[PDB]
Every structure is written in structure tokens, then in C-alpha cells.
């Protein structure tokens, strides 16, 4: 009944707009742009496909993606969904019925997929409509964890669900593989901010994994738990202050020598108009019994 009219589009212009480098953990994105002329024969229910590469997703830090409708003035020309291959299928409305000379433009942001692109390095991104494609080689740079003397830490936020008011934060503690004596981690709101995070025994769930080979760690902060050793039951998780958690890492010799992954599944306050603004602080001694801390801030604008 409906026809795939991809091949009948004309004047198809596809561009990937970015700089030389994309920094996913800075919430960097590329802009995907598509312009085309629609055939006069097009009717309601006709479709076309945008091919999106496996290196990209359309959701970014959010759990689900919503494809923007293609507009003709203040009317909807086409509605889009993401199929199971990650490609976008647009279906034309009755706007095209009894119209000629119809043209369209649509732009949407796209994000580097952390499961598909686990490491820093060049990737060639290709997108298209039919055999009309665009390609661009870009450096994907996840940059490095923070370090202060023998203390290292970094975290990233993903899986923000604004319907169910949830978020995920993945933290690497001691990714440098230093010796840290009497380590502790706290998770907090960033000072001098209206932050929408609810951190407490009800709202926060924490899993901890020991990393026996640091080469197994993704630079993208994609984590498959089965790759690591779940040690949740051997750490001590508490909530000593309002909107703060603490994790202690007791060991038989009072130090750690390996990285740990801390996976926080938390909640957002729907009453807040603030941003999701989190501070992770790692504490410990070095071998000269100097007590230090270092913090890592993650912030997602709402």
C-alpha cells in the first residue's frame, strides 16, 4: 500500500557537520543534515530511509531517542521512527496529497555510541539516503582520567530517563593502578549549583567491580559487568550525609592496587528545574602517609 520512495527523491543533499575532533564525554555531537525534493507522485504512507552508521546513535546521554518530524511551514510533512538496525524510517503524511514541488530539510544531532566505539581514535562516519551518502573522518577523543599524585578518578553519565526520573553514572576509581591506602569514594552534588539528583539509600543503587586487568577498561566508559569481578558484597556503601553516598574498599592489607568500577543507578527529582550535577571525590593516602582527595564533576544540562 505504502511505497519506499527513497530512490525517487531528487536533489538529495547529505552533510555531516562537525569539527576535526568529537569529544563524547564533553557531550559533543555531530549534526546530520538532509535536504531533498519529494516526487510529485508521493502520497500519504510512502516512506524513505536514512541510513545511520553503527558508530552513531540518536539518544546520546538519554535512554531513548526521539526523531524530529520533518516540517513544511507549520505542518508535519513526515514522522520518523528508528528501526531495529538503528536506521530512520520516515513516513509521509497527507500533506503531500495534492501538492507538487515539495522540498524538505531536516537536521538532527548524533552522538558517538560508547559500545561501538570503545577507544579513542579516528573513525569514518557515513550516512545517506539511498545511494546519496556523505562520509567524514573524525578523531573521537575520550581524553584521560583525572590524576592528583597517587589518586585517579573519572566518571560519565548516561541512561537519563526523564519519564521515569532515573540516571546512570559509571565511575573508574584508581584507573592508574596506583597503591592507595585506606581509599574512600564519596558521591555528591556539585557545590554552588541547583542539582536535581536524589542521593540516598532509597534513591541510589550501587554496584562495584574489581578490575584485575586494566587493559580491559574501555575509554568510552561502556561497561559489560560480566567482564569484571562483582565485589559489591565486599565493599561498604553508606549514606552519611544528605544527598551523599560513601563507598569504602576494605582489604586485608588496608590498600588497593587495582582499578574499581562503580556503577550508580540513581534518581532525579521531578520537582527540580536544576541540572544533573554530580561530584565524585576520591580520598586516600600515599606511601608517605599524605592524605589527599581529588574530585571529578559530571553535569548534564536539563
Amino acid at each position: 500500500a505504502g511505497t519506499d520512495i527513497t530512490n525517487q527523491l531528487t536533489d538529495v543533499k547529505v552533510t555531516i557537520d562537525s569539527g576535526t575532533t568529537v569529544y563524547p564525554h564533553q557531550a559533543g555531537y555531530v549534526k546530520l543534515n538532509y535536504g531533498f525534493s519529494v516526487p510529485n507522485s508521493a502520497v500519504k504512507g510512502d516512506t524513505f530511509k536514512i541510513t545511520v552508521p553503527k558508530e552513531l546513535n540518536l539518544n546520546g546521554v538519554t535512554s531513548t531517542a526521539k526523531v524530529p518530524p520533518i516540517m513544511a511551514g507549520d505542518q508535519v510533512l513526515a514522522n520518523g521512527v528508528i528501526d531495529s538496525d538503528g536506521n530512520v524510517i520516515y513516513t509521509f503524511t497527507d500533506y503531500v496529497d495534492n501538492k507538487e514541488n515539495v522540498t524538505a530539510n531536516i537536521t538532527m544531532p548524533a552522538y558517538i555510541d560508547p559500545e561501538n566505539v570503545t577507544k579513542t581514535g579516528n573513525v569514518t562516519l557515513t550516512t545517506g539516503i539511498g545511494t546519496n551518502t556523505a562520509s567524514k573522518t573524525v578523531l573521537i577523543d575520550y581524553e584521560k582520567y583525572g590524576q592528583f599524585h597517587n589518586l585517579s578518578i573519572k566518571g560519565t553519565i548516561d541512561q537519563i530517563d526523564k519519564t521515569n526520573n532515573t540516571y546512570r553514572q559509571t565511575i573508574y576509581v584508581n584507573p592508574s593502578g596506583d597503591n592507595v591506602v585506606l581509599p574512600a569514594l564519596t558521591g555528591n552534588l556539585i557545590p554552588n549549583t541547583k542539582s536535581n539528583a536524589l542521593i540516598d539509600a532509597k534513591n541510589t543503587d550501587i554496584k562495584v567491580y574489581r578490575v584485575d586487568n586494566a587493559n580491559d577498561l574501555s575509554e568510552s566508559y561502556y561497561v559489560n559487568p560480566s567482564d569484571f569481578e562483582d565485589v559489591t558484597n565486599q565493599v561498604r556503601i553508606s549514606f552519611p550525609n544528605a544527598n551523599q553516598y560513601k563507598v569504602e574498599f576494605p582489604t586485608d592489607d588496608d590498600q588497593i592496587t587495582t582499578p574499581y568500577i562503580v556503577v550508580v543507578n540513581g534518581h532525579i527529582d521531578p520537582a527540580s528545574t536544576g541540572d544533573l550535577a554530580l561530584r565524585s571525590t576520591f580520598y586516600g593516602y600515599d606511601s608517605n602517609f599524605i592524605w589527599r582527595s581529588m574530585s571529578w564533576d559530571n553535569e548534564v544540562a536539563f
Epitope: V181, L182, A184, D253, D254, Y285, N288, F289, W291
Partner: antibody, heavy 123, light 108 residues
Framework: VQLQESGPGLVKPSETLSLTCTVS????????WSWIRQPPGKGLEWIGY???????NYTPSLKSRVTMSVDTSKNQFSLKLSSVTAADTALYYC??????????????????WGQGTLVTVSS | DIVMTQSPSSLSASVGDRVTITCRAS??????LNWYQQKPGKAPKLLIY???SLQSGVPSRFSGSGSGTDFTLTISSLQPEDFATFYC?????????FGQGTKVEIKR
């Protein structure tokens, strides 16, 4: 918990001073321990620490002459100081070393101390 | 391993007098300052740790205060048995610096 130092009270110049600290009324395990010395009528000088697992840290000025070791089965740890001279004549103390950790926001202190044992370097 | 300056080198005070001993660090050491008492022919004994915490069993006439660079040991009412050399000790880093000591003599 009581600590007791033991070892020769007389050592010849250029040879090695050896002392042992015996822990009683408690266990040596899962703790840090230090050696600290005091020349007669002078102040205190920390020499180094050992954790019961065997890791150590020695004061930079003495590191090239110091060895500390532990035998947890005997509830004892030891100090060896090589290339001795009259400058090493002192009371030698062992002491349990506590770390303040998160609760105290850092720091460390020495408690309890042994009785001290005098070593004289002389020909 | 921070330079410390303990004052005074000695003092003489009567029983019941208030006595103050001070320690100055050359850079800030937060709360990382301990006090020891050394009686004649005895090892040092911990009196105060982490600036202000009193060791168990130590009389409450002994108090510690201060933060940053400047620390004070106070004896509110000097007693005969308090005769000793007192030492501060910073715990910012190993090797820890001990103060030069204060010899407390009792006037009678």
C-alpha cells in the same frame, strides 16, 4: 598491647645494628609499626615504618642503611642499620603507628611505644 | 616532613599554674599535630592526637587546640607529676617532624 625491644647494646663501628620488637597482649597483623630513635639528651627521629604484610618506607637520610622485616608468626618485627658510627648511638623505640583515615581527615600517630633499648656504637 | 618550631625550650611554673606550650608549622598541616609527654627514663607517651583528641586515661587538665600552622598544648592546673619533656609531632607526611621539646620544671 605491650611492645618490647631487644638486641645487642654494643656494636662496633662499620658493622650492623640489629634489633627486634616483640608484640605481646595482641597481634602484629593488619597494622603499621615504626622505629624511632633518640640520642641521649636529644630529641626524636623517626626511622621508618613497616606494615605487617611487609611493605615499608624509610626516612630518606637513612634509607640506604636501613632494612625492616616482619615475622608475623612470632609477633615480631626487626630493624637492621648498617655502616654504623657513633652518630647512631641512641635509644631505639618501636611503636604502633595509627592512621587517622577518613574519620580524622588524614594524619597518623604513635601509640603504644616500647620501653626503648640503648645501642652504643664503640670499638 | 614539615619544619616545626616548638616554644618555649623550657619553663618553670608552680603547682596550680596554667601552662601553655606552642608549636608552629612552616606550612599548613590542617589538624595533623600530636603531643607526647616524656618522663625521665621513660619512652614518650601519647597525650593528644589529631590536634585536640585526648588519649584515654589522660587527665582533662591537658587540652590541645589549633589548626593550620599554629598549635597549643594547655595545662590548666600544673601538678607535680606533670614534670616531663613535651614534644609535638606533625603528621602531614613521613618522615614526621618532632618539635624540639619543652622541659617543664615545677617551682616549689
Amino acid at each position: 598491647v605491650q611492645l618490647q625491644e631487644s638486641g645487642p647494646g654494643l656494636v662496633k663501628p662499620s658493622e650492623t645494628l640489629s634489633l627486634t620488637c616483640t608484640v605481646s597482649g595482641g597481634s602484629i597483623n593488619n597494622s603499621y609499626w615504626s622505629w624511632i630513635r633518640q640520642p641521649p639528651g636529644k630529641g626524636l627521629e623517626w626511622i621508618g615504618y613497616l606494615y605487617s604484610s611487609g611493605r615499608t618506607n624509610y626516612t630518606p637520610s637513612l634509607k640506604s642503611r636501613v632494612t625492616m622485616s616482619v615475622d608475623t608468626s612470632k609477633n615480631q618485627f626487626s630493624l637492621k642499620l648498617s655502616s654504623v658510627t657513633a652518630a647512631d648511638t641512641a635509644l631505639y623505640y618501636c611503636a604502633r603507628t595509627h592512621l587517622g583515615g577518613f574519620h580524622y581527615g588524614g594524619g597518623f600517630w604513635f601509640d603504644p611505644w616500647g620501653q626503648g633499648t640503648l645501642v652504643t656504637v664503640s670499638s | 616532613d614539615i619544619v616545626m618550631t616548638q616554644s618555649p625550650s623550657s619553663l618553670s611554673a608552680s603547682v596550680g599554674d596554667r601552662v601553655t606550650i606552642t608549636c608552629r608549622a612552616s606550612q599548613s598541616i590542617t589538624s595533623y599535630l600530636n603531643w607526647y609527654q616524656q618522663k625521665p627514663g621513660k619512652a614518650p607517651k601519647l597525650l593528644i592526637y589529631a590536634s585536640s583528641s585526648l588519649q584515654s586515661g589522660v587527665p582533662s587538665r591537658f587540652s590541645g587546640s589549633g589548626s593550620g600552622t599554629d598549635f597549643t598544648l594547655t595545662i590548666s592546673s600544673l601538678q607535680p607529676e606533670d614534670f616531663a619533656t613535651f614534644y609535638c609531632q606533625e603528621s602531614y607526611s613521613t618522615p614526621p617532624t618532632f618539635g624540639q621539646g619543652t622541659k617543664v620544671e615545677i617551682k616549689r
